[PDB]
Design an enzyme around this catalytic site. Structure first.
Site, PDB file in Angstrom:
ATOM      1  N   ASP A 239     -31.423  37.883  51.374  1.00  0.00           N
ATOM      2  CA  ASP A 239     -30.213  38.265  52.088  1.00  0.00           C
ATOM      3  C   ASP A 239     -30.459  39.552  52.866  1.00  0.00           C
ATOM      4  O   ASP A 239     -30.784  40.587  52.273  1.00  0.00           O
ATOM      5  CB  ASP A 239     -29.026  38.450  51.143  1.00  0.00           C
ATOM      6  CG  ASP A 239     -27.756  38.776  51.907  1.00  0.00           C
ATOM      7  OD1 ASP A 239     -27.182  37.837  52.500  1.00  0.00           O
ATOM      8  OD2 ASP A 239     -27.369  39.969  51.971  1.00  0.00           O
TER       9      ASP A 239
ATOM     10  N   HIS B 145     -20.554  39.363  59.684  1.00  0.00           N
ATOM     11  CA  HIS B 145     -20.657  40.284  58.552  1.00  0.00           C
ATOM     12  C   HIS B 145     -19.286  40.719  58.015  1.00  0.00           C
ATOM     13  O   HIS B 145     -19.086  40.775  56.801  1.00  0.00           O
ATOM     14  CB  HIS B 145     -21.502  41.489  58.962  1.00  0.00           C
ATOM     15  CG  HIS B 145     -22.135  42.221  57.823  1.00  0.00           C
ATOM     16  ND1 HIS B 145     -23.343  42.869  57.951  1.00  0.00           N
ATOM     17  CD2 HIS B 145     -21.710  42.453  56.558  1.00  0.00           C
ATOM     18  CE1 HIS B 145     -23.647  43.452  56.804  1.00  0.00           C
ATOM     19  NE2 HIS B 145     -22.670  43.217  55.942  1.00  0.00           N
TER      20      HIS B 145
ATOM     21  N   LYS C 148     -26.890  38.702  59.251  1.00  0.00           N
ATOM     22  CA  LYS C 148     -25.475  38.906  59.554  1.00  0.00           C
ATOM     23  C   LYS C 148     -25.308  39.647  60.868  1.00  0.00           C
ATOM     24  O   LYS C 148     -26.052  40.597  61.169  1.00  0.00           O
ATOM     25  CB  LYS C 148     -24.771  39.682  58.427  1.00  0.00           C
ATOM     26  CG  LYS C 148     -25.177  39.241  57.023  1.00  0.00           C
ATOM     27  CD  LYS C 148     -24.321  39.888  55.943  1.00  0.00           C
ATOM     28  CE  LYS C 148     -24.906  39.625  54.564  1.00  0.00           C
ATOM     29  NZ  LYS C 148     -26.092  40.509  54.277  1.00  0.00           N
TER      30      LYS C 148
ATOM     31  N   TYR D 220     -28.419  46.966  57.827  1.00  0.00           N
ATOM     32  CA  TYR D 220     -29.159  47.566  56.710  1.00  0.00           C
ATOM     33  C   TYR D 220     -30.355  48.386  57.193  1.00  0.00           C
ATOM     34  O   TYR D 220     -30.935  49.140  56.409  1.00  0.00           O
ATOM     35  CB  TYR D 220     -29.625  46.517  55.679  1.00  0.00           C
ATOM     36  CG  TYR D 220     -28.511  45.699  55.049  1.00  0.00           C
ATOM     37  CD1 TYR D 220     -27.181  46.101  55.119  1.00  0.00           C
ATOM     38  CD2 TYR D 220     -28.796  44.501  54.391  1.00  0.00           C
ATOM     39  CE1 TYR D 220     -26.168  45.325  54.573  1.00  0.00           C
ATOM     40  CE2 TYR D 220     -27.787  43.730  53.833  1.00  0.00           C
ATOM     41  CZ  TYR D 220     -26.479  44.143  53.928  1.00  0.00           C
ATOM     42  OH  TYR D 220     -25.476  43.368  53.390  1.00  0.00           O
TER      43      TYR D 220
HETATM   44  N1  NAP Z   1     -21.770  40.872  53.075  1.00  0.00           N
HETATM   45  C1  NAP Z   1     -21.484  42.129  52.684  1.00  0.00           C
HETATM   46  O1  NAP Z   1     -20.589  42.794  53.183  1.00  0.00           O
HETATM   47  C2  NAP Z   1     -22.278  42.715  51.554  1.00  0.00           C
HETATM   48  C3  NAP Z   1     -21.811  43.841  50.879  1.00  0.00           C
HETATM   49  C4  NAP Z   1     -22.520  44.356  49.794  1.00  0.00           C
HETATM   50  C5  NAP Z   1     -23.705  43.729  49.421  1.00  0.00           C
HETATM   51  N2  NAP Z   1     -24.160  42.648  50.114  1.00  0.00           N
HETATM   52  C6  NAP Z   1     -25.471  41.963  49.745  1.00  0.00           C
HETATM   53  O2  NAP Z   1     -25.515  41.792  48.327  1.00  0.00           O
HETATM   54  C7  NAP Z   1     -26.682  42.436  47.788  1.00  0.00           C
HETATM   55  C8  NAP Z   1     -26.405  42.879  46.338  1.00  0.00           C
HETATM   56  O3  NAP Z   1     -25.351  43.854  46.283  1.00  0.00           O
HETATM   57  P1  NAP Z   1     -25.581  45.412  46.113  1.00  0.00           P
HETATM   58  O4  NAP Z   1     -26.850  45.838  46.763  1.00  0.00           O
HETATM   59  O5  NAP Z   1     -24.340  46.067  46.593  1.00  0.00           O
HETATM   60  O6  NAP Z   1     -25.623  45.741  44.551  1.00  0.00           O
HETATM   61  P2  NAP Z   1     -26.098  44.963  43.214  1.00  0.00           P
HETATM   62  O7  NAP Z   1     -27.116  43.813  43.508  1.00  0.00           O
HETATM   63  O8  NAP Z   1     -24.885  44.615  42.434  1.00  0.00           O
HETATM   64  O9  NAP Z   1     -26.824  46.148  42.431  1.00  0.00           O
HETATM   65  C9  NAP Z   1     -28.005  46.761  42.967  1.00  0.00           C
HETATM   66  C10 NAP Z   1     -28.321  47.932  42.029  1.00  0.00           C
HETATM   67  O10 NAP Z   1     -28.612  47.432  40.714  1.00  0.00           O
HETATM   68  C11 NAP Z   1     -29.900  47.870  40.265  1.00  0.00           C
HETATM   69  N3  NAP Z   1     -30.495  46.780  39.515  1.00  0.00           N
HETATM   70  C12 NAP Z   1     -30.946  45.625  39.976  1.00  0.00           C
HETATM   71  N4  NAP Z   1     -31.384  44.892  39.027  1.00  0.00           N
HETATM   72  C13 NAP Z   1     -31.242  45.550  37.863  1.00  0.00           C
HETATM   73  C14 NAP Z   1     -31.547  45.226  36.542  1.00  0.00           C
HETATM   74  N5  NAP Z   1     -32.123  44.062  36.181  1.00  0.00           N
HETATM   75  N6  NAP Z   1     -31.244  46.176  35.629  1.00  0.00           N
HETATM   76  C15 NAP Z   1     -30.673  47.358  35.959  1.00  0.00           C
HETATM   77  N7  NAP Z   1     -30.366  47.680  37.231  1.00  0.00           N
HETATM   78  C16 NAP Z   1     -30.659  46.770  38.177  1.00  0.00           C
HETATM   79  C17 NAP Z   1     -30.667  48.191  41.558  1.00  0.00           C
HETATM   80  O11 NAP Z   1     -31.647  49.195  41.290  1.00  0.00           O
HETATM   81  P3  NAP Z   1     -33.116  49.213  41.920  1.00  0.00           P
HETATM   82  O12 NAP Z   1     -33.051  48.551  43.348  1.00  0.00           O
HETATM   83  O13 NAP Z   1     -33.510  50.657  41.955  1.00  0.00           O
HETATM   84  O14 NAP Z   1     -34.056  48.383  40.956  1.00  0.00           O
HETATM   85  C18 NAP Z   1     -29.539  48.774  42.424  1.00  0.00           C
HETATM   86  O15 NAP Z   1     -29.244  50.142  42.133  1.00  0.00           O
HETATM   87  C19 NAP Z   1     -26.880  43.599  48.789  1.00  0.00           C
HETATM   88  O16 NAP Z   1     -28.161  44.217  48.645  1.00  0.00           O
HETATM   89  C20 NAP Z   1     -26.723  42.808  50.090  1.00  0.00           C
HETATM   90  O17 NAP Z   1     -27.885  42.013  50.323  1.00  0.00           O
HETATM   91  C21 NAP Z   1     -23.471  42.136  51.151  1.00  0.00           C
HETATM   92  O1  2YZ Z   2     -21.385  45.903  54.741  1.00  0.00           O
HETATM   93  C1  2YZ Z   2     -22.354  45.704  53.843  1.00  0.00           C
HETATM   94  O2  2YZ Z   2     -23.063  44.722  53.796  1.00  0.00           O
HETATM   95  C2  2YZ Z   2     -22.534  46.794  52.828  1.00  0.00           C
HETATM   96  O3  2YZ Z   2     -21.825  47.972  53.240  1.00  0.00           O
HETATM   97  C3  2YZ Z   2     -22.389  48.706  54.274  1.00  0.00           C
HETATM   98  C4  2YZ Z   2     -23.757  48.619  54.535  1.00  0.00           C
HETATM   99  C5  2YZ Z   2     -24.315  49.374  55.562  1.00  0.00           C
HETATM  100  F1  2YZ Z   2     -25.618  49.292  55.810  1.00  0.00           F
HETATM  101  C6  2YZ Z   2     -23.507  50.217  56.328  1.00  0.00           C
HETATM  102  C7  2YZ Z   2     -22.140  50.301  56.060  1.00  0.00           C
HETATM  103  C8  2YZ Z   2     -21.564  49.555  55.027  1.00  0.00           C
HETATM  104  C9  2YZ Z   2     -20.068  49.618  54.769  1.00  0.00           C
HETATM  105  O4  2YZ Z   2     -19.494  50.699  54.787  1.00  0.00           O
HETATM  106  N1  2YZ Z   2     -19.394  48.460  54.583  1.00  0.00           N
HETATM  107  C10 2YZ Z   2     -17.949  48.462  54.365  1.00  0.00           C
HETATM  108  C11 2YZ Z   2     -17.225  47.951  55.630  1.00  0.00           C
HETATM  109  C12 2YZ Z   2     -17.939  47.667  56.804  1.00  0.00           C
HETATM  110  C13 2YZ Z   2     -17.272  47.205  57.948  1.00  0.00           C
HETATM  111  C14 2YZ Z   2     -15.886  47.020  57.929  1.00  0.00           C
HETATM  112  C15 2YZ Z   2     -15.166  47.304  56.765  1.00  0.00           C
HETATM  113  C16 2YZ Z   2     -15.839  47.762  55.627  1.00  0.00           C
END
Ligand code: NAP
Ligand code: 2YZ
Length: 315
Positions: A43, A110, A77, A48
Site C-alpha cells: 500500500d 485518497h 492513491k 507519503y
Molecule cells: N488511506 C488513508 O488515508 C490511510 C491512512 C492511514 C494509513 N493508511 C495506510 O495504512 C497503513 C497502516 O497504518 P499506519 O501506518 O497508520 O499504522 P499501523 O499499521 O496501525 O501501525 C504502524 C506502527 O506499528 C508498529 N508495528 C508494526 N508492527 C508491529 C508489531 N508486530 N509489533 C509492534 N509494533 C508494530 C510500527 O513500527 P515499526 O514500523 O517501527 O516496526 C509502526 O509504529 C499505512 O502505513 C498506510 O499504508 C492509509
Molecule cells: O492520509 C494518509 O494516508 C495518512 O495521513 C497523512 C499522511 C501524509 F503523508 C500526510 C498527511 C496525512 C494526513 O494528515 N491525513 C489526514 C487528512 C488528509 C486529508 C484530508 C483530511 C484528513
C-alpha cells in the site's frame, strides 16, 4: 484464502504492507524483506513521499525473479491537490514513474476532499484553513475511470469516503466502473460496522488501515488509548500463543477485510505475516468488536471546514 475477489474480476491479497511514515532510507529494505517473506500487496501513496524508494525494492525483486509482476498487487492513491479532472492522469503517471511500474493494480481517491492544485500538499489561506477545489468528486471519478480505459490501472477505488459519499459514486449518472475498494481506518477502537456492512452489501471490498492504531502517528499523545498495550487484547493473543499485533491483524481478516499493517522492522514485517495459522473464535471476534470507542487515528482539523470532510456524518 489469501486473496479476495474484487468486482473488477481481479484477486487482491488480504494482507499488505503499509508504507505511510516508512522513512525513505528504510523503506526499500522493508519492502524487499516483505516480498522475501511472502507479502504480495504493498500500500503506497504519492503523499507519503517515498514511492521512489518503494519502487526500487519492487524493481529489484522483479529483476531478481523473486516474484512476477502479475503476482504483485500494488496500490497507490491520488492526492487531494490532484482532483481536477485534467490533473488526474499526470498524478497517476508520476506515481507509476516513481514506483517503476507500467500499471497499478488499484488506484484510490485518497480523500473525498479536493484541494487547490500546486506543490503544497495542504495549501492554506492566510488564516490557516485548507483551500478547497471546486471540482465535483463525480468528475474526479470519471477521470479515474479513464485510467482504467487507458491501461494505467487495473482497478479504481476510494478511501475515507463515508456512506453518503460512497452512495454518491454508486448513484453517479453514467457510472462506468464501480469502486472496487473503500480503504478506511478500522481496528477494535473504531470498528466501523455500519460503513463496512454498507460497502460489502454493494460488493465493495473494504481495506482496514491503521490496524495497530498507528502508534507512530505524528500527532500521538502520551495519554491516548493503545491497542498494542490493551491487556484484554493481550489476553486473547496469549490464548492463541500469538502476539497482540497478530491478533489485531487477524481480526479484520475474519471480517472479510483486507488489512495493511505498516512496519520497517524486519522482525515485525515477518511477524505480521504469520497470521494464516490460527483462527479467532466468533466469541473472540465479538469481544474485539465490543471494544469500539469511535476513536480515530486519522482526521485533520485544518480540513474539518471543507464541504466534503467525511467524518461529520455518523458513518
Ligand atoms: N488511506 C488513508 O488515508 C490511510 C491512512 C492511514 C494509513 N493508511 C495506510 O495504512 C497503513 C497502516 O497504518 P499506519 O501506518 O497508520 O499504522 P499501523 O499499521 O496501525 O501501525 C504502524 C506502527 O506499528 C508498529 N508495528 C508494526 N508492527 C508491529 C508489531 N508486530 N509489533 C509492534 N509494533 C508494530 C510500527 O513500527 P515499526 O514500523 O517501527 O516496526 C509502526 O509504529 C499505512 O502505513 C498506510 O499504508 C492509509
Ligand atoms: O492520509 C494518509 O494516508 C495518512 O495521513 C497523512 C499522511 C501524509 F503523508 C500526510 C498527511 C496525512 C494526513 O494528515 N491525513 C489526514 C487528512 C488528509 C486529508 C484530508 C483530511 C484528513
Amino acid at each position: 484464502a489469501s486473496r479476495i475477489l474484487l468486482n473488477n474480476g481481479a484477486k487482491m491479497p488480504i494482507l499488505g504492507l503499509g508504507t505511510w511514515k516508512s522513512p525513505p532510507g528504510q523503506v526499500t529494505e522493508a519492502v524487499k524483506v516483505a516480498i522475501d517473506v511472502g507479502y504480495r500487496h504493498i500500500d503506497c501513496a504519492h503523499v507519503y513521499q517515498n514511492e521512489n524508494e518503494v519502487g526500487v525494492a519492487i524493481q529489484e525483486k522483479l529483476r531478481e525473479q523473486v516474484v512476477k509482476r502479475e503476482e504483485l498487487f500494488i496500490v497507490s492513491k491520488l492526492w487531494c491537490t490532484y482532483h481536477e479532472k485534467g490533473l488526474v492522469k499526470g498524478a497517476c503517471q508520476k506515481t507509476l514513474s516513481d514506483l517503476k511500474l507500467d500499471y497499478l493494480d488499484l488506484y484510490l481517491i485518497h480523500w473525498p476532499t479536493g484541494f487547490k492544485p500546486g506543490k503544497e500538499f495542504f495549501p492554506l489561506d492566510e488564516s490557516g484553513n485548507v483551500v478547497p477545489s471546486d471540482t465535483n468528486i463525480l468528475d474526479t471519478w470519471a477521470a479515474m475511470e479513464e485510467l482504467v480505459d487507458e491501461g494505467l490501472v487495473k482497478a479504481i477505488g476510494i478511501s475515507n469516503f463515508n456512506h453518503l459519499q460512497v452512495e454518491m459514486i454508486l448513484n453517479k449518472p453514467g457510472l462506468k466502473y464501480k469502486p472496487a475498494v473503500n480503504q478506511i481506518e478500522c481496528h477494535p477502537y473504531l470498528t466501523q460496522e455500519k460503513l463496512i456492512q454498507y460497502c460489502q452489501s454493494k460488493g465493495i471490498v473494504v481495506t482496514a488501515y491503521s490496524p495497530l492504531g498507528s502508534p507512530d502517528r505524528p500527532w500521538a499523545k502520551p495519554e491516548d488509548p493503545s491497542l498494542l498495550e490493551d491487556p484484554r487484547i493481550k489476553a486473547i493473543a496469549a490464548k492463541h500463543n500469538k502476539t497482540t499485533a497478530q491478533v489485531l491483524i487477524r481480526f479484520p481478516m475474519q471480517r472479510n477485510l483486507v488489512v495493511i499493517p505498516k512496519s520497517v522492522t524486519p522482525e515485525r514485517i515477518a511477524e505480521n505475516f504469520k497470521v494464516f495459522d490460527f483462527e479467532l473464535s466468533s466469541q473472540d471476534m465479538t469481544t474485539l468488536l465490543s471494544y469500539n470507542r469511535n476513536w480515530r487515528v486519522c482526521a485533520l482539523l485544518s480540513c474539518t471546514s471543507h464541504k466534503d470532510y467525511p467524518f461529520h456524518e455518523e458513518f
